[PDB]
């Protein structure tokens, strides 16, 4: 079980049961960022210090898809479902098999929508999703 | 008489009768140094010498690579195959071994030149075989074994 | 609570020094075995000699 | 043990156990180049200087093979193995018997692939491999 | 079944059913090159290393034809078909019978077009085709 | 109607009614090149692919003429007409009688101008023309 | 003491005590180049001028050696010494006895490394060294 080379052929992402397939080119196709800073250091006028830790365990994820990808169809159906009035979680979770690095969430929600650009060639479609809780998994294989 | 082929081989310009109907002949066409400058100079003290002051004499030898170019000819009804075996014996190891710092480099194109000798077309073949080997020599030379240095500060 | 003295065998011969050398040996043997079985033949010349030398020259690199 | 003349009949290369046989014509059939420069000199506006030494001990090797060589078959199998998802080292090492000059590596990886040109005659097939560490051997016989 | 000498009389190429016949002179008349590099080695500031493997299995092929070749007619019909609006695959595949070296693809597309030069003699016409997948065949006869 | 040998005595070019006669020596005296590439393949980070086809059907043509050719006079009159302010099409079309290979355009425009070099001997004069549409003719006689 | 003809048999180079012997063929086997330009002239919009002189007295040297040369062994030992972590100067100095032209440095460092090409014949090995100071010697015999 040697720590093999990194490859996109071992990263798996699941969005409400079905997989994510059509991804745009680039070094950043699925990016997750935390909500706020972990903490804040406050230093007074005398030199003492006090650290404050937040309770906000939330994250956002950005997915970049080609204009022709079944995940795009699934997401554009979910967006219309939200617009109609129905509101549900559709859990999303992704992981790398080489080092067990990644995370999972229980209830996400569509936060942004892509811009439909036609032009002369294909263009990215970016979706931004937001969770209320986000649990990373500890990479046990280093 | 080569070990690879089973025939008799003789030197280039002799004054003897032609040995048999199939046989070979090797000539030295030329040779030359290969690189412009030396690789190393080897210094060695002569065994039990003296230059008149209780010092063993020193002999220096340059080391450079050299190329020798020979001219091989096979006369008789089997020349092409005998030289084809030589061409294909240059690739296999433990077979193309030469004694001292020598290496067969390349065997060249093989031509056929039948000649009307003695009322009969005598089959013939000829090629070029080039070797490659370092250079040895030795000349007596002189050596430094002490020093002297003077240091002054002009204006103190 | 923890182990002490490092599992010596003589005055200053520790257990890990034995374990690592045994691993090196048992690795070179396996790699040598996996070399007669892949190639058909290993000739009896310097060409084949360096080919056999290629195994320790990689195990030492992987060990350092 | 005189320093004999150079010859390709004394150079030995081993790629994952088996030898390399089919090599194209030319003065450069197996070429290894280091990753980056050994160091960098920085001279300031006053005339002082500072040298910086890198920790990148990596190398790449280029092998040129005929279209009909068993090493070509081995490499084109290894390439497909990597494409499938398996990732391993396949150590490569080469040396010259006349001066013990050369080097070895423990874990390589196929980095480039040749271009299949048919044309009217035979054409080279160039493979480029990359290691993370590369240990040269010191030429002890000068 | 000895590994016979190479010859252009044993190389077969098929472009959408029909064969390719009219080829220009030269050591490179049908050349296939992969899309991107197989991988990339990244070495950090400390000396550790990490290899990354791509999922891009795509290739391009360049064919050189005489100004009078039925394949030129076929290709210039396919180009006009694409310009009209129809879009299809027209699989292309080529192989050498002496060593089973070559490859195949399922759906190609015309990517470049030749330049119509008249001049005083005949000139090459180069076509460049691109696939989304390209499967080489392993040379089993060495 | 056998496919006869190629010859410059069967190639006909017409520039706004009158023929083109004075052409410089060389294997390339009338060369037409398309505007842009036919298409573009985009492969994402997962391995899927999408091809994009352009709507740009435009071409440029380069004609090389001797310093003494009536076509040179015609072109240098047309250039001055454009400089004065008049703007028209002057259709250009050329074809080979042996294989019906070539093309036609409806409205061209002078894009480049030659350099008047005198020197000791005769020098080429190159004109570059550009169209907005370019229709090739399919070579029906192979 | 007439200014004799130039010859490579009177040029002496010393690299950390020992001499340099194995040098490749060519009109340039040991070449030293300065770090940066000596100065820079700046002319303003009015016609006045100002010259600026640098304090960078540094140089680089390139040595070309055969694959079988004791200097190659010495340099490849020094390179490994640097890679291990040891960092020292190893002064290099060279001169021509016919005109006292040349220079010396006090502390050099290996900056580049050669490429190990085997091929069919011998190939050059180029080493590039860099100093922080370089003092040329004035040719007193013209």
- Partners of F94 on chain E (C-beta within 8 Å) are 118
Separation of alpha carbons D28 and D62, rounded Å: 9
Which region holds residue B126: left if phi is over 0, alpha if psi is between -120 and 50, else beta?
beta
Q: Tell me the CB-side half-sphere exposure of residue A43, using CA atoms within 13 A.
A: 1
Q: What is the end-to-end Cα distance of chain A in Å, rounded? A: 11
- Partners of B37 on chain G (C-beta within 8 Å) are 8, 23, 25
Are E56 and F47 in contact, with CB atoms under 8 Å apart? yes
Contact state of D138 with G77 under an 8 Å Cβ cutoff: yes
**Rg, Å, chain B Cα set:** 26
Closest by Cβ to B134, choosing from D4, D7, D9: D4
Are E109 and F51 in contact, with CB atoms under 8 Å apart? yes
Are E134 and E51 in contact, with CB atoms under 8 Å apart? no
Spacing of C-alpha G1 from chain mean position: 28
Separation of alpha carbons A30 and D79, rounded Å: 27
By three-state DSSP, how is residue D8 classified? Answer: helix
Separation of alpha carbons D84 and E26, rounded Å: 35
Q: Who contacts E84 (Cβ-Cβ below 8 Å, separation ≥6)?
A: none
Q: What is the largest CA-CA distance in chain B?
A: 101
Q: Tell me the CB-side half-sphere exposure of residue A31, using CA atoms within 13 A.
A: 11
Copy the structure tokens of residue G96: 């021509």
Separation of alpha carbons E11 and E97, rounded Å: 6
Å between E12 CA and nearest CA of chain A = 34
By three-state DSSP, how is residue F80 classified? Answer: helix
Copy the structure tokens of residue F105: 């355009």
Å between D108 CA and nearest CA of chain C = 12
Q: Does C45 touch chain D (CB under 8 A)?
A: no
Exposed, middle or buried: residue E100 (CB in 10 Å: 0-12, 13-18, 19+)?
middle
Å between E77 CA and nearest CA of chain A = 24
Nearest to A57 by CA among A80, A71, A36, A86: A36
Nearest CA in chain A to E49: A5
Three-state DSSP string of A8-51 = HHHEEEEECCEECCCCCCCCCCEEEEECCCCEEEEECCCCCEEE
- Partners of D95 on chain C (C-beta within 8 Å) are 50, 53-54
Method: cryo-EM
Closest by Cβ to A22, choosing from F40, F44, F54: F44
Are D106 and D71 in contact, with CB atoms under 8 Å apart? no
- Partners of F93 on chain E (C-beta within 8 Å) are none
Contact state of D41 with G56 under an 8 Å Cβ cutoff: no
Contact state of A9 with E39 under an 8 Å Cβ cutoff: no
Q: What are phi and psi of C59, to 5 degrees?
A: -65, -40
By three-state DSSP, how is residue B118 classified? Answer: coil
Copy the structure tokens of residue A46: 């005398």
- The pairing of strands A11-15 and A18-19 is antiparallel
Exposed, middle or buried: residue D68 (CB in 10 Å: 0-12, 13-18, 19+)?
buried
DSSP assignments along G40-108, one per residue = EEEE-SSS-EEEEE-----EEEEEEE-SS-HHHHHHHHHHHHHHHT------EEEEETTTTEEEE-S-E
Closest by Cβ to E130, choosing from F31, F41, F136: F41
Separation of alpha carbons A60 and A110, rounded Å: 10
Copy the structure tokens of residue D70: 């068993």
Q: Who contacts E66 (Cβ-Cβ below 8 Å, separation ≥6)?
A: E22, E23, E24, E72, E122, E124, E125
Counting as contact any 3 or more CB pairs under 8 A, the partners of C are: B, D
Task: Give whole-number Cα distances, E77 to D141, F1, F116, F138, in Å.
Answer: 67, 22, 41, 7
What b/e string do you get for D25-39 counting C-beta neighbours within 10 Å, with b at 16 or more? eeeebbbbebbeebb
Copy the structure tokens of residue G109: 């460092």
Q: Which residues pair with G109 in a beta bridge?
A: G130
Q: Who contacts G36 (Cβ-Cβ below 8 Å, separation ≥6)?
A: G54, G56, G58
Are D71 and D126 in contact, with CB atoms under 8 Å apart? no
Nearest to E137 by CA among D27, D76, F50: D76
Q: Tell me the CB-side half-sphere exposure of residue G76, using CA atoms within 13 A.
A: 24
Separation of alpha carbons E26 and F110, rounded Å: 36
Which region holds residue A47: left if phi is over 0, alpha if psi is between -120 and 50, else beta?
left
Q: What are phi and psi of A83, to 5 degrees?
A: -60, -35
- Across chain D, where does the E strand assignment appear? 11-15, 18-19, 30-34, 39-43, 49-53, 59-65, 92-96, 101-104, 108-110, 116-117, 125-131, 135-137
- The pairing of strands B121-122 and B115-116 is antiparallel
Place of tokens 């069919």: G120
- The pairing of strands B9-11 and B23-33 is parallel
Counting CB pairs under 8 A, whether chains E and G reach 3 or more, is: no
Closest by Cβ to D27, choosing from G69, G110, G119: G119
């Amino acid at each position: 079980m040697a720590m093999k080379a990194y490859s996109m052929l071992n990263v798996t992402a699941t969005l409400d049961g079905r997989r994510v397939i059509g991804l745009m080119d680039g070094d950043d196709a699925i990016t997750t960022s935390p909500g706020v800073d972990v903490g804040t250091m406050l230093v007074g006028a005398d030199g003492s210090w006090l650290f404050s830790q937040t309770a906000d365990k939330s994250a956002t994820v950005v997915i970049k898809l080609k204009p022709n990808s079944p995940t795009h169809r699934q997401l554009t159906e979910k967006w219309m479902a939200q617009r109609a009035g129905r509101l549900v979680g559709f859990p999303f979770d992704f992981i790398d098999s080489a080092s067990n690095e990644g995370g999972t969430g229980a209830e996400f929600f569509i936060q942004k929508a892509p811009d439909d650009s036609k032009g002369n060639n294909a263009v990215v479609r970016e979706w931004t999703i937001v969770t209320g809780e986000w649990t990373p998994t500890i990479p046990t294989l280093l | 008489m080569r070990r690879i082929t089973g025939i008799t081989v003789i030197k280039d310009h002799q004054s003897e009768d032609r040995p048999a109907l199939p046989y070979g002949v090797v000539e030295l066409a030329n040779f030359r140094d290969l690189h412009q400058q030396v690789r190393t100079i080897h210094y060695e003290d002569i065994e039990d010498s003296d230059n008149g002051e209780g010092f063993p004499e020193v002999q220096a030898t340059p080391e450079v690579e050299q190329e020798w170019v020979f001219l091989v000819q096979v006369y008789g009804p089997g020349g092409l195959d005998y030289l084809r075996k030589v061409a294909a014996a240059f690739h296999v190891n433990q077979v193309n071994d030469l004694p001292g710092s020598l290496v067969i480099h390349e065997v060249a194109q093989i031509n056929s030149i039948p000649e009307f000798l003695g009322e009969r077309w005598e089959k013939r073949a000829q090629t070029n075989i080039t070797l490659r080997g370092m250079s040895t020599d030795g000349f007596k030379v002189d050596v430094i074994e002490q020093h002297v240095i003077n240091v002054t500060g002009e204006r103190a | 609570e923890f182990l002490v003295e490092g599992s010596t065998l003589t005055q200053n011969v520790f257990l890990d020094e034995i374990h690592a050398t045994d691993w090196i040996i048992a690795r070179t043997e396996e790699e040598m075995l996996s070399l007669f079985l892949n190639n058909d033949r290993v000739p009896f010349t310097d060409q084949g000699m360096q080919q056999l030398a290629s195994v320790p020259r990689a195990i030492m690199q992987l060990a350092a």
